[PDB]
Amino acid sequence: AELKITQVRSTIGARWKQRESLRTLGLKKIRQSVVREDNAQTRGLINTVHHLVEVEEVG
Template identity: 75%
Template sequence: MRARDRESDMAELKVTQVKSSIGAKKNQRDSLRTLGLRGIRKSVVRPDNAQNRGLINVVRHLVSVEEVDA
């Protein structure tokens, strides 16, 4: 099974920024941008994979995460 096919079977994560990135370290601001978050109360839905989990882990104090069905 190809990786792309496996990702479509996996759940997705809804990531919402709940705190400002002002005063955050550069790598944390970069992680928010990579996730597609550009402001407080903005949400994105991302696939649940190791790359996105790592980005979320870096900014876990600035975001809230919910699991949604694909």
């Protein structure tokens, strides 16, 4: 149902789109986690920044 996010890497060496999209998801620091919907918006952001986030699934 919902996706659970965990930021792993850092935003340094990282481009504008990746940085702005972490901001979009609400992630600023490392080890922050977010409970986000699994809609197309979210899936596209994760496709964008998969190397920065571990993604788990409650559902």
